[PDB]
Paper text:
The T-cell receptor (TCR) recognizes peptides bound to major histocompatibility molecules (MHC) and allows T-cells to interrogate the cellular proteome for internal anomalies from the cell surface. Here we explored these issues using phage display to generate a high affinity TCR derived from the MEL5 TCR specific for the heteroclitic version of the HLA-A*0201-restricted primary melanoma antigen recognized by T-cells 1 (MART-126–35) peptide, ELAGIGILTV (A2-ELA). This TCR, α24β17, bound to A2-ELA with an affinity 30,000 times stronger than the natural parent MEL5 TCR, resulting in picomolar levels of binding. Remarkably, although the enhanced affinity was mediated primarily through new TCR-MHC contacts, α24β17 remained acutely sensitive to modifications at every position along the peptide backbone, mimicking the specificity of the wild type TCR.
Residue numbers in the entry:
A (entry chain A): 1 to 275
B (entry chain B): 0 to 99
C (entry chain C): 1 to 10
Write the structure that this text describes.
């Protein structure tokens, strides 16, 4: 019953087309709760979940000031990085940053993170001890040194293991009805002939929360990973998730296959068989 | 200069039942850079008033977005999602199959 | 809530 709070930041430059675009988003577990979009007329951090709307003007004003400061730093980052990598002035580039914290079922701190990528590649990351940095580049080593002199890791440590966890516990209680819910997957199988001698067997998991789930097919109780078509878990759009797994079986062997479903919402993992 | 092709899934929020209101979704994921074009089609016509989630990314830095529109499926109406990205030499069209 | 310190330019 672990949880987490995570902020996601994306900055994309657009040469000769004005300011870089900046998008910030925040999540509690798999539920998004705030956003900020540099191209929006609002110029404000905005609510994306009903339980966050109760926060007063002091919270919104504060998060707006901070998200604008994040936006500005990434503005600068973009130009600095072109320079470190001596690349053209006219090419669009992307910078990404993510940070947050995880807590266990007891809501105690498990780990913290703060990572940064340039054009989709790891740039610099805070290690798990929250004291050292990983820099897989000569340019990333230059950033590592400035961040070391500024004692940035010590400041992030206080936030990740203190402030970050403090806000996650508050959001978890304020939005308990949504965030502390366990919606077990509604399951069913579909069968479809593909030919005279083969049929498709699809196992469905619908309307579940949280998103974490294991869904597998086995033949005579044996692993069939190679022969299983498994789609990545996807959002229904109403706060729940969906996933399906399928195997092509020779007609008349339906009874040899079993779909297995494991999810926090289920007391006991489920085993289904077309029968 | 990393470029990753988007995975595409077209599907309804609830089980498809003719004459009953629902949401048609097009979930694009695992792509980079973030520039992407996503349209929902009804019998080959681009649907207006299609909304999408706020841009976010996965643990491997790849992006994901959900496009969505409210619809009422019928027996004869065909739906599809068309996606264009720098990794596709041609816009990819994925047709909606109510069993997927 | 967002972090208020430690977000330094690269």
């Amino acid at each position: 019953g672990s949880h987490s709070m995570r902020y996601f930041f994306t900055s994309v430059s657009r040469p000769g087309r004005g300011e870089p675009r900046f998008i910030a988003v925040g999540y509690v577990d798999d539920t998004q709760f705030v956003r900020f979009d540099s191209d929006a007329a609002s110029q404000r951090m905005e609510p994306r979940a009903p339980w966050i709307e109760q926060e007063g003007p002091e919270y919104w004003d504060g998060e707006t000031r901070k998200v604008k400061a994040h936006s500005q730093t990434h503005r600068v980052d973009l130009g600095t990085l072109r320079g470190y990598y001596n690349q053209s002035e006219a090419g669009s580039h992307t910078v990404q940053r993510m940070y947050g914290c995880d807590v266990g079922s007891d809501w105690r701190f498990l780990r913290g993170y703060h990572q940064y990528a340039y054009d989709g590649k790891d740039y610099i990351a805070l290690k798990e001890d929250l004291r050292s940095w990983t820099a897989a580049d000569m340019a990333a080593q230059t950033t590592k040194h400035k961040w070391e002199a500024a004692h940035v890791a010590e400041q992030l440590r206080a936030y990740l293991e203190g402030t970050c966890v403090e806000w996650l516990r508050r959001y978890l209680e304020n939005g308990k009805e949504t965030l502390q819910r366990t919606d077990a997957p509604k399951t069913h199988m579909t069968h479809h002939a593909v030919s005279d001698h083969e049929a498709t067997l699809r196992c469905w998991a619908l309307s579940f929360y949280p998103a974490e789930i294991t869904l597998t097919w086995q033949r005579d109780g044996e692993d069939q990973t190679q022969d299983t078509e498994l789609v990545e878990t996807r959002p229904a759009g109403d706060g729940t998730f969906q996933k399906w797994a399928a195997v092509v079986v020779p007609s008349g062997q339906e009874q040899r296959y079993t779909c297995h479903v494991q999810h926090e919402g289920l007391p006991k993992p489920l085993t289904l068989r077309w029968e | 200069m990393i470029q990753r092709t988007p995975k595409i899934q077209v599907y309804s929020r609830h089980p498809a039942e003719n004459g009953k209101s629902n949401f048609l979704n097009c979930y694009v994921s695992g792509f980079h850079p973030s520039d992407i074009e996503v349209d929902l089609l009804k019998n080959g016509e681009r649907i207006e008033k299609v909304e999408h989630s706020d841009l976010s990314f996965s643990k491997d830095w790849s992006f994901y977005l959900l496009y969505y529109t409210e619809f009422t499926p019928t027996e004869k109406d065909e739906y599809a999602c068309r996606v264009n990205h720098v990794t596709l030499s041609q816009p990819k069209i994925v047709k909606w199959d109510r069993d997927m | 809530a967002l972090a208020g310190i430690g977000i330094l330019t690269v």
